Short mmCIF file of C-alpha atoms (C1' of nucleotides) in Angstrom, two decimals:
data_model
loop_
_atom_site.label_atom_id
_atom_site.label_comp_id
_atom_site.label_asym_id
_atom_site.label_seq_id
_atom_site.Cartn_x
_atom_site.Cartn_y
_atom_site.Cartn_z
CA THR A 4 89.85 96.41 149.05
CA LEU A 5 93.45 97.50 148.44
CA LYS A 6 91.98 100.70 146.98
CA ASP A 7 93.82 102.62 149.69
CA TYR A 8 97.13 101.03 148.82
CA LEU A 9 97.64 102.32 145.26
CA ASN A 10 101.25 103.40 144.69
CA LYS A 11 102.41 102.92 148.30
CA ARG A 12 105.28 100.66 149.36
CA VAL A 13 104.02 97.27 150.48
CA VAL A 14 105.06 94.10 152.30
CA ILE A 15 103.67 90.83 150.98
CA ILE A 16 103.78 87.61 152.97
CA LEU A 17 103.23 84.55 150.81
CA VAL A 18 101.59 81.27 151.85
CA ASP A 19 105.01 79.56 151.49
CA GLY A 20 106.26 82.05 154.10
CA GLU A 21 108.56 84.51 152.31
CA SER A 22 108.41 88.32 152.44
CA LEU A 23 108.61 90.87 149.61
CA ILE A 24 108.96 94.67 149.50
CA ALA A 25 107.30 96.25 146.50
CA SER A 26 105.06 98.89 144.95
CA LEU A 27 101.55 97.96 143.84
CA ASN A 28 100.53 99.76 140.65
CA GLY A 29 97.39 97.68 140.09
CA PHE A 30 95.30 94.86 141.56
CA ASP A 31 92.19 92.77 140.77
CA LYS A 32 89.31 91.18 142.72
CA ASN A 33 91.33 87.98 142.92
CA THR A 34 94.05 89.93 144.69
CA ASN A 35 96.46 89.39 141.78
CA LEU A 36 99.30 91.69 142.83
CA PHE A 37 100.45 93.84 139.92
CA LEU A 38 103.73 95.17 141.33
CA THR A 39 107.09 96.72 140.39
CA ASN A 40 110.64 96.83 141.76
CA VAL A 41 110.10 93.65 143.76
CA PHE A 42 112.75 92.21 146.08
CA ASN A 43 113.08 89.83 149.04
CA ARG A 44 113.00 90.93 152.67
CA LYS A 47 117.81 90.71 150.36
CA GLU A 48 118.50 91.29 146.67
CA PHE A 49 115.98 92.80 144.26
CA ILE A 50 114.17 90.48 141.85
CA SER A 51 112.49 92.67 139.22
CA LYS A 52 111.02 95.97 138.02
CA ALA A 53 107.40 95.33 137.06
CA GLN A 54 106.17 91.85 137.98
CA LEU A 55 102.91 89.95 138.40
CA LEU A 56 102.04 87.97 141.51
CA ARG A 57 99.05 85.63 141.68
CA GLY A 58 96.51 86.10 144.45
CA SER A 59 96.71 82.43 145.29
CA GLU A 60 100.25 82.89 146.65
CA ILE A 61 99.45 86.04 148.67
CA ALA A 62 98.77 85.22 152.30
CA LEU A 63 98.91 88.77 153.45
CA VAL A 64 99.44 92.35 152.31
CA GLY A 65 100.71 95.06 154.64
CA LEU A 66 101.14 98.79 154.09
CA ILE A 67 104.61 100.22 154.73
CA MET B 1 76.58 86.05 153.16
CA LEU B 2 75.70 85.38 156.81
CA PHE B 3 79.28 85.65 158.12
CA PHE B 4 79.70 88.84 156.12
CA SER B 5 76.99 90.38 158.34
CA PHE B 6 78.46 88.91 161.49
CA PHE B 7 81.98 90.03 160.65
CA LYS B 8 80.63 93.53 160.01
CA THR B 9 79.08 93.37 163.48
CA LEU B 10 82.64 93.35 164.82
CA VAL B 11 84.21 96.53 163.43
CA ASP B 12 86.32 98.80 165.67
CA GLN B 13 87.18 95.69 167.68
CA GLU B 14 90.49 94.09 168.62
CA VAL B 15 90.78 90.46 167.55
CA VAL B 16 93.46 87.81 167.12
CA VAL B 17 93.76 86.30 163.66
CA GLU B 18 95.64 83.05 163.12
CA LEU B 19 96.70 82.12 159.59
CA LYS B 20 97.31 78.69 158.02
CA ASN B 21 101.02 79.48 157.85
CA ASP B 22 100.94 79.57 161.66
CA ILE B 23 101.63 83.28 161.60
CA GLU B 24 99.55 85.07 164.24
CA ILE B 25 98.43 88.72 164.37
CA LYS B 26 96.48 91.01 166.77
CA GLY B 27 94.65 94.11 165.59
CA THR B 28 91.60 96.36 165.26
CA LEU B 29 89.14 95.06 162.64
CA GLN B 30 88.75 98.02 160.32
CA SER B 31 87.12 96.32 157.32
CA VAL B 32 85.42 93.08 156.17
CA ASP B 33 84.42 91.89 152.70
CA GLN B 34 82.67 88.81 151.27
CA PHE B 35 85.66 86.52 150.78
CA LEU B 36 86.10 87.33 154.45
CA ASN B 37 89.30 89.23 153.61
CA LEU B 38 90.37 91.13 156.70
CA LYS B 39 91.69 94.58 157.49
CA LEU B 40 93.39 95.66 160.68
CA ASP B 41 94.66 98.91 162.12
CA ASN B 42 97.36 98.63 164.82
CA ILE B 43 99.28 95.48 163.95
CA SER B 44 100.78 93.74 167.02
CA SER B 45 102.56 90.54 168.09
CA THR B 46 101.04 87.79 170.23
CA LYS B 50 104.06 82.94 165.53
CA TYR B 51 104.59 86.52 164.36
CA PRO B 52 105.94 87.62 160.97
CA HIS B 53 109.03 89.80 161.22
CA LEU B 54 107.42 93.19 160.73
CA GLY B 55 107.89 96.18 163.01
CA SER B 56 107.07 99.07 160.68
CA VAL B 57 103.58 98.19 159.40
CA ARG B 58 100.34 99.80 160.59
CA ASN B 59 97.44 98.44 158.55
CA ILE B 60 97.17 95.08 156.80
CA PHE B 61 95.17 93.17 154.23
CA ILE B 62 94.78 89.57 155.20
CA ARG B 63 93.83 87.24 152.38
CA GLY B 64 90.62 85.58 153.52
CA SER B 65 91.40 82.17 152.04
CA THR B 66 94.40 81.92 154.36
CA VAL B 67 92.72 82.46 157.73
CA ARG B 68 92.30 79.44 160.00
CA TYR B 69 91.00 80.96 163.19
CA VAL B 70 89.58 84.26 164.30
CA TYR B 71 89.56 84.56 168.08
CA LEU B 72 86.67 86.51 169.58
CA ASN B 73 85.57 87.47 173.08
CA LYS B 74 82.19 86.20 174.26
CA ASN B 75 81.00 89.77 174.71
CA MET B 76 81.43 90.97 171.12
CA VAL B 77 78.67 88.68 170.03
CA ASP B 78 75.01 88.02 170.63
CA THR B 79 74.62 84.25 170.61
CA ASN B 80 70.83 84.06 170.16
CA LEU B 81 71.20 86.37 167.16
CA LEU B 82 73.79 84.13 165.44
CA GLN B 83 71.88 81.02 166.40
CA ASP B 84 68.53 81.98 164.92
CA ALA B 85 70.17 83.63 161.91
CA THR B 86 71.87 80.31 161.26
CA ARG B 87 68.56 78.60 161.86
CA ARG B 88 67.21 80.79 159.08
CA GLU B 89 70.09 80.53 156.61
CA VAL B 90 69.21 78.60 153.47
CA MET B 91 71.37 75.93 151.85
CA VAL C 11 72.71 58.77 136.91
CA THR C 12 75.17 59.85 139.57
CA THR C 13 72.28 62.17 140.48
CA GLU C 14 69.92 59.20 141.11
CA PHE C 15 72.46 56.83 142.66
CA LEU C 16 72.82 59.32 145.51
CA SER C 17 69.09 58.85 145.98
CA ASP C 18 69.31 55.12 145.52
CA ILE C 19 71.48 54.20 148.49
CA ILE C 20 69.89 56.37 151.13
CA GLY C 21 69.55 54.33 154.30
CA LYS C 22 72.13 51.78 153.17
CA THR C 23 75.55 51.29 154.68
CA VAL C 24 78.36 53.04 152.92
CA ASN C 25 82.09 53.49 153.14
CA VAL C 26 83.02 57.10 152.60
CA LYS C 27 86.72 57.79 151.99
CA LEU C 28 88.11 61.30 152.38
CA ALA C 29 91.14 62.83 150.62
CA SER C 30 93.26 62.04 153.72
CA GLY C 31 92.82 58.29 153.47
CA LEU C 32 90.50 58.11 156.50
CA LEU C 33 87.35 56.14 155.82
CA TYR C 34 84.02 56.06 157.57
CA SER C 35 81.55 53.20 157.65
CA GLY C 36 77.91 53.96 158.38
CA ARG C 37 74.27 54.30 157.41
CA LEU C 38 73.60 57.11 154.92
CA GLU C 39 71.21 59.70 156.39
CA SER C 40 71.45 62.24 153.54
CA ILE C 41 73.64 63.87 150.91
CA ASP C 42 73.55 67.11 148.89
CA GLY C 43 74.77 68.33 145.52
CA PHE C 44 77.95 69.64 147.13
CA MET C 45 79.07 66.13 148.07
CA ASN C 46 78.15 66.62 151.73
CA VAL C 47 77.31 63.47 153.61
CA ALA C 48 75.48 62.68 156.82
CA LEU C 49 76.14 59.29 158.35
CA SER C 50 74.56 57.78 161.41
CA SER C 51 76.56 55.49 163.70
CA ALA C 52 79.84 55.96 161.82
CA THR C 53 83.13 54.23 162.63
CA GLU C 54 86.52 55.58 161.56
CA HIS C 55 89.32 53.50 160.04
CA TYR C 56 92.45 54.36 158.10
CA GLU C 57 92.48 53.11 154.51
CA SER C 58 90.51 49.97 155.39
CA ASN C 59 87.75 48.81 157.74
CA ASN C 60 89.93 45.77 158.49
CA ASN C 61 92.48 48.02 160.10
CA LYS C 62 92.38 49.33 163.62
CA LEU C 63 89.14 51.02 164.63
CA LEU C 64 90.12 54.58 165.52
CA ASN C 65 86.79 56.03 166.51
CA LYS C 66 83.13 55.25 167.11
CA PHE C 67 80.56 57.98 166.70
CA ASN C 68 77.39 57.29 168.66
CA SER C 69 75.51 60.14 167.00
CA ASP C 70 75.44 61.76 163.57
CA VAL C 71 78.55 62.44 161.53
CA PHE C 72 78.86 65.30 158.97
CA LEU C 73 81.43 64.67 156.22
CA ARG C 74 82.48 67.74 154.23
CA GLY C 75 82.00 67.50 150.47
CA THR C 76 85.32 68.90 149.25
CA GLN C 77 87.06 66.22 151.19
CA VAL C 78 85.11 63.27 149.83
CA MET C 79 87.03 60.85 147.60
CA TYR C 80 84.35 58.19 147.33
CA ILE C 81 80.99 56.89 148.55
CA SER C 82 80.97 53.09 148.19
CA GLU C 83 78.35 50.51 149.13
CA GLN C 84 78.57 47.01 150.66
CA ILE D 6 86.31 62.72 118.63
CA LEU D 7 84.92 64.01 121.90
CA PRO D 8 86.31 62.94 125.34
CA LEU D 9 82.81 62.26 126.75
CA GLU D 10 81.97 60.04 123.75
CA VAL D 11 84.98 57.95 124.58
CA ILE D 12 83.96 57.77 128.23
CA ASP D 13 80.44 56.96 127.04
CA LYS D 14 81.57 54.00 124.97
CA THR D 15 83.37 52.54 127.99
CA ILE D 16 80.10 52.16 129.86
CA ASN D 17 79.73 48.46 130.76
CA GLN D 18 83.43 47.80 130.21
CA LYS D 19 86.40 47.59 132.54
CA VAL D 20 87.97 50.99 133.23
CA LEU D 21 91.05 52.15 135.10
CA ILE D 22 90.77 55.50 136.89
CA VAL D 23 93.97 57.25 137.96
CA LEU D 24 93.76 59.96 140.60
CA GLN D 25 95.97 63.04 140.68
CA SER D 26 97.45 61.22 143.67
CA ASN D 27 99.02 57.79 143.91
CA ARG D 28 95.79 55.88 143.89
CA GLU D 29 93.97 53.92 141.20
CA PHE D 30 90.61 52.24 140.86
CA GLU D 31 89.78 49.46 138.42
CA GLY D 32 86.26 48.26 137.80
CA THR D 33 83.26 48.23 135.51
CA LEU D 34 82.11 51.65 134.43
CA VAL D 35 78.36 52.01 134.92
CA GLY D 36 77.82 55.74 134.43
CA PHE D 37 79.17 59.30 134.52
CA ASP D 38 77.84 62.88 134.73
CA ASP D 39 78.83 66.29 133.35
CA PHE D 40 81.26 66.94 136.21
CA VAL D 41 82.79 63.57 135.32
CA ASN D 42 81.89 62.06 138.61
CA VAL D 43 82.00 58.29 138.09
CA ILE D 44 80.02 55.22 139.06
CA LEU D 45 82.19 52.09 139.35
CA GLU D 46 81.15 48.49 139.98
CA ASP D 47 83.21 46.14 142.16
CA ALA D 48 86.19 48.45 142.15
CA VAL D 49 89.56 47.23 143.24
CA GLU D 50 91.40 50.17 144.88
CA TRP D 51 95.22 50.44 144.74
CA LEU D 52 98.03 52.55 146.16
CA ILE D 53 100.94 52.95 143.72
CA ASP D 54 104.77 52.92 143.78
CA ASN D 61 102.04 48.21 144.65
CA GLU D 62 99.35 47.70 147.29
CA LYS D 63 95.74 46.52 147.07
CA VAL D 64 93.87 48.46 149.69
CA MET D 65 90.40 46.94 149.23
CA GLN D 66 87.91 45.04 147.07
CA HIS D 67 84.63 46.89 146.77
CA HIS D 68 81.30 45.14 146.32
CA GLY D 69 78.39 47.04 144.83
CA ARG D 70 78.56 50.53 143.29
CA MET D 71 80.99 53.33 144.04
CA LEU D 72 80.48 57.04 143.40
CA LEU D 73 84.01 58.17 142.71
CA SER D 74 84.30 61.93 143.00
CA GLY D 75 85.29 63.32 139.60
CA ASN D 76 87.20 65.99 141.51
CA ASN D 77 90.43 64.10 141.90
CA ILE D 78 90.22 62.18 138.62
CA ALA D 79 93.22 62.77 136.33
CA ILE D 80 93.18 59.86 133.84
CA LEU D 81 90.67 57.31 132.60
CA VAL D 82 91.80 54.24 130.69
CA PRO D 83 89.35 51.92 128.94
CA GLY D 84 90.42 48.37 129.88
CA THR E 3 69.95 68.15 153.89
CA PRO E 4 73.18 67.33 155.81
CA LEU E 5 73.38 71.05 156.67
CA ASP E 6 69.85 70.95 158.14
CA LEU E 7 70.79 67.92 160.20
CA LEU E 8 73.68 70.13 161.23
CA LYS E 9 71.14 72.81 162.26
CA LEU E 10 69.70 70.22 164.63
CA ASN E 11 72.60 70.69 167.04
CA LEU E 12 72.76 74.46 167.51
CA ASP E 13 73.45 75.32 171.14
CA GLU E 14 74.64 71.71 171.43
CA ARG E 15 78.24 70.66 172.02
CA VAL E 16 80.11 69.55 168.91
CA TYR E 17 83.28 67.72 167.89
CA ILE E 18 85.02 68.89 164.73
CA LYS E 19 87.90 67.36 162.85
CA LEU E 20 90.12 69.71 160.83
CA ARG E 21 93.08 69.23 158.47
CA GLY E 22 96.44 68.95 160.17
CA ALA E 23 95.51 66.60 163.02
CA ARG E 24 93.53 69.42 164.65
CA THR E 25 90.50 68.73 166.80
CA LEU E 26 88.08 71.27 168.28
CA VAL E 27 85.42 70.69 170.91
CA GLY E 28 83.03 73.56 171.68
CA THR E 29 79.43 74.84 171.56
CA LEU E 30 77.95 75.39 168.09
CA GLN E 31 77.03 79.03 167.79
CA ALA E 32 76.98 79.41 163.99
CA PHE E 33 77.71 78.05 160.53
CA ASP E 34 77.04 78.48 156.81
CA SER E 35 77.22 76.28 153.70
CA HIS E 36 81.02 76.56 153.56
CA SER E 37 81.07 74.87 156.96
CA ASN E 38 82.32 78.21 158.26
CA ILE E 39 81.74 78.11 162.00
CA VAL E 40 81.53 80.11 165.19
CA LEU E 41 82.09 78.24 168.47
CA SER E 42 82.26 79.23 172.14
CA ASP E 43 84.06 77.75 175.13
CA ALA E 44 86.10 75.68 172.70
CA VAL E 45 89.39 73.87 173.24
CA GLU E 46 91.56 72.92 170.27
CA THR E 47 94.01 70.05 170.50
CA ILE E 48 96.74 69.63 167.92
CA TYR E 49 98.64 66.43 167.22
CA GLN E 50 102.23 67.13 166.23
CA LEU E 51 105.12 64.85 165.30
CA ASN E 52 108.52 66.33 166.11
CA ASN E 53 111.86 64.62 166.70
CA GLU E 54 110.24 61.32 165.76
CA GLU E 55 107.78 61.39 168.64
CA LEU E 56 104.12 62.26 168.93
CA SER E 57 102.80 64.96 171.16
CA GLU E 58 99.56 66.75 171.73
CA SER E 59 99.01 70.39 172.48
CA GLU E 60 96.00 72.48 173.56
CA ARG E 61 94.48 75.94 173.22
CA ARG E 62 91.42 77.33 174.96
CA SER E 63 89.42 80.24 173.55
CA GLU E 64 86.06 81.73 174.55
CA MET E 65 84.83 82.64 171.09
CA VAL E 66 86.36 81.42 167.88
CA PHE E 67 85.38 81.74 164.23
CA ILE E 68 86.49 78.92 161.92
CA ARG E 69 87.33 78.99 158.22
CA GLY E 70 85.34 76.19 156.60
CA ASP E 71 87.91 75.18 153.98
CA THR E 72 89.89 73.31 156.64
CA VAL E 73 86.89 71.54 158.21
CA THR E 74 86.77 67.74 157.80
CA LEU E 75 84.12 66.21 159.96
CA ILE E 76 81.44 67.38 162.32
CA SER E 77 79.72 65.38 164.98
CA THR E 78 79.13 65.44 168.71
CA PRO E 79 81.45 64.32 171.56
CA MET F 1 95.45 99.13 135.53
CA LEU F 2 94.24 95.64 136.35
CA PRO F 3 96.96 93.03 135.84
CA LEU F 4 94.69 91.06 133.49
CA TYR F 5 93.92 93.96 131.09
CA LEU F 6 97.63 94.64 131.43
CA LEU F 7 98.05 91.12 130.12
CA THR F 8 95.63 91.41 127.19
CA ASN F 9 97.46 94.57 126.05
CA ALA F 10 100.71 92.64 126.38
CA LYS F 11 100.06 90.31 123.44
CA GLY F 12 103.25 90.43 121.35
CA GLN F 13 105.77 91.41 124.04
CA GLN F 14 108.17 88.92 125.67
CA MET F 15 107.75 87.51 129.19
CA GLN F 16 108.88 85.02 131.83
CA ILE F 17 106.52 82.87 133.89
CA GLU F 18 107.14 81.00 137.11
CA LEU F 19 105.03 77.87 137.49
CA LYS F 20 104.51 76.55 141.01
CA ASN F 21 106.78 73.62 140.20
CA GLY F 22 110.16 75.30 140.48
CA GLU F 23 109.99 75.47 136.69
CA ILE F 24 110.73 78.64 134.78
CA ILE F 25 109.48 79.64 131.34
CA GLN F 26 110.93 82.32 129.04
CA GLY F 27 108.82 83.03 125.97
CA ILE F 28 107.05 85.65 123.91
CA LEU F 29 103.27 85.70 124.37
CA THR F 30 100.69 84.99 121.62
CA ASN F 31 97.35 84.88 123.49
CA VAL F 32 95.76 85.48 126.93
CA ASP F 33 92.35 85.16 128.57
CA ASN F 34 90.23 85.71 131.66
CA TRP F 35 91.66 82.81 133.67
CA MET F 36 95.19 83.90 132.74
CA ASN F 37 95.60 80.93 130.42
CA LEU F 38 98.52 81.70 128.16
CA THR F 39 99.61 80.62 124.75
CA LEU F 40 103.26 81.45 124.33
CA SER F 41 105.50 81.00 121.29
CA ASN F 42 109.30 81.16 121.02
CA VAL F 43 109.62 79.37 124.29
CA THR F 44 112.11 77.77 126.59
CA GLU F 45 111.41 75.96 129.88
CA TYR F 46 113.65 74.72 132.72
CA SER F 47 113.43 72.94 136.06
CA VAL F 64 113.81 72.64 126.20
CA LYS F 65 112.96 74.84 123.21
CA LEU F 66 109.36 74.75 121.94
CA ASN F 67 107.17 76.30 119.20
CA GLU F 68 104.06 76.90 121.26
CA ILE F 69 102.96 76.22 124.85
CA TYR F 70 99.69 76.52 126.77
CA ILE F 71 99.57 77.02 130.51
CA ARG F 72 96.77 76.78 133.05
CA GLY F 73 96.47 80.05 134.94
CA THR F 74 96.08 78.31 138.27
CA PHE F 75 99.55 76.82 137.96
CA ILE F 76 101.28 80.17 137.87
CA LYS F 77 103.08 81.53 140.90
CA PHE F 78 104.22 84.82 139.32
CA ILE F 79 105.09 86.50 136.03
CA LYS F 80 108.33 88.48 135.65
CA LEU F 81 108.19 91.07 132.86
CA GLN F 82 110.61 93.47 131.18
CA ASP F 83 111.84 96.85 132.42
CA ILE G 27 92.68 80.39 122.90
CA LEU G 28 94.70 77.39 121.83
CA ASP G 29 93.36 75.65 118.75
CA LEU G 30 94.13 71.98 119.45
CA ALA G 31 93.00 71.07 115.92
CA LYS G 32 96.52 71.79 114.73
CA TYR G 33 97.70 68.89 116.86
CA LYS G 34 95.57 66.20 115.21
CA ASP G 35 97.48 62.91 115.28
CA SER G 36 100.41 64.82 116.78
CA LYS G 37 102.69 64.51 119.81
CA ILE G 38 102.40 66.56 122.99
CA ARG G 39 103.99 66.55 126.45
CA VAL G 40 101.14 67.26 128.86
CA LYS G 41 102.01 68.30 132.39
CA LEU G 42 99.35 67.42 134.97
CA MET G 43 98.85 68.68 138.53
CA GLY G 44 100.42 66.34 141.06
CA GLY G 45 103.58 65.88 139.06
CA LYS G 46 102.50 63.55 136.32
CA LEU G 47 103.80 63.98 132.81
CA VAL G 48 101.99 62.36 129.89
CA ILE G 49 103.11 61.97 126.31
CA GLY G 50 100.41 60.97 123.86
CA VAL G 51 98.88 61.14 120.40
CA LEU G 52 96.22 63.82 120.44
CA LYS G 53 93.36 61.80 119.12
CA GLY G 54 90.59 64.24 120.07
CA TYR G 55 89.53 66.85 122.60
CA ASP G 56 86.82 69.22 123.82
CA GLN G 57 86.21 72.63 125.36
CA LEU G 58 86.82 72.10 129.08
CA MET G 59 90.14 71.03 127.47
CA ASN G 60 89.81 67.30 128.02
CA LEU G 61 92.10 65.21 125.88
CA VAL G 62 91.95 61.80 124.27
CA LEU G 63 95.50 60.48 123.93
CA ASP G 64 96.86 57.41 122.23
CA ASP G 65 99.85 55.21 122.97
CA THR G 66 99.75 57.21 126.18
CA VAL G 67 102.89 57.04 128.21
CA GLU G 68 102.56 58.19 131.81
CA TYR G 69 105.84 59.49 133.17
CA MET G 70 105.45 59.20 136.95
CA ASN G 85 108.90 56.46 136.09
CA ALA G 86 107.86 55.05 132.74
CA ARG G 87 104.32 53.68 132.74
CA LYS G 88 102.36 52.66 129.65
CA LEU G 89 98.62 53.06 129.29
CA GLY G 90 96.81 52.73 125.98
CA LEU G 91 94.25 55.11 124.63
CA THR G 92 93.39 57.32 127.60
CA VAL G 93 91.19 60.26 128.52
CA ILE G 94 92.76 63.14 130.44
CA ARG G 95 90.55 65.28 132.62
CA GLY G 96 91.23 68.86 131.50
CA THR G 97 90.67 70.41 134.92
CA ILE G 98 93.96 69.13 136.23
CA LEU G 99 95.82 69.99 133.00
CA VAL G 100 98.76 72.17 133.91
CA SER G 101 100.70 72.63 130.67
CA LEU G 102 100.56 71.49 127.07
CA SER G 103 103.44 71.51 124.62
CA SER G 104 104.35 69.45 121.55
CA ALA G 105 106.44 66.37 120.81
"C1'" G H 1 85.12 75.64 132.41
"C1'" U H 2 90.57 77.85 136.69
"C1'" U H 3 93.10 81.94 142.85
"C1'" U H 4 88.85 83.22 148.45
"C1'" U H 5 85.62 77.42 151.01
#
RNA sequence: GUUUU
């Protein structure tokens, strides 16, 4: 699980091959990334956003 | 179910995971679940995403293509008869 | 009805087309509820059996269910 | 008026099935199941936008999976 | 039943077609109903089209696990 | 908090959805469920101003919300 | 969650998965969210079908017309 | 009935 990752900064690599720096406040068993202060990896995109598990290829702890 | 077992049989090991995206990643298998989602301590480059600062990663299971494993880490008669037993 | 058809053509010769457009001609050995298909002595053609033969399989061929577009007789 | 009742009434008629891709089948509808898999009789199969890929003879189990549209007629 | 007929060839060399013009030949060590697979002594060959020409590439690995969602066909060489 | 519960307790607020088509949808949200199917109202879509609009969860890339 | 009954004999632009738009007259429907449309136009790009059935497992969006 | 076969 990502139950170790709560509130840490994270790097997400999407299946389309883009990277994002973010903070994961919450997540579900479909790896739907509930995150805030998202931005590329280089201009921010949002504070508080929802990413769908289907587009996550990979989550890394930073 | 079966491959959940087998993947658990491989913890504390260093494997090479290749994703569909063609990204490729070496590491120590720290955790396995049912969807086959993967966890790795000690991320390294062997095709590699541009990360230098990340230690431990969560690989979405649905996006793996290959897991590369040494012949040693595995009993082949075990897997074979297990498979022979699996129901479908 | 679909349920019984897949019992009705066992042993016959079928064309199975996959999502890719590849098609496989051969005798039906068996099939399951997940769309999986076992052919014996299957040949591989693209789009049509009138096209270039691309492969002959001497032994059994396992076609994965998710990938199956159709199972056609003739 | 329920979708399946429509598809039921088109049993024994000519039906046009349009895939979520660029492919179409026309033929007699014989039967369908709950997953809307489809039996077709003497289907002509087409690639669109045309081209006639094949004339089928006998019955065809057309995987309901990729089915997007059905059209009686 | 096609998965049983698959069971027939355990410890027997197999030829698998995958999405993306990828072919694997190797010895069938394991598999489940998702067509997930473990193979040994397996070479993968990939067909790639770049610069308007075809080429083929290769990749040997002793033990390899294979995600079943990409699997297309299984037979024997 | 799970993103989905955090969607059910979002009924009435205003949100933006990105479909995996390149298409963008601003709109306030009138209903949600377990597959993330959405019924929005007061809606505009890009690459058009609409009363209602239903969306299949599996066609969502992401969902930008408010500060 | 959507009550399609309020669309009886109405117009709706239905987006399908694979880039296929369809404008029809919502003649009927069910719970998997299958439609029955009338005077169906399939925007591929104009293409006219008649009274069609739309499999509601590839239905991507549903608005009005 | 819909993301990890």
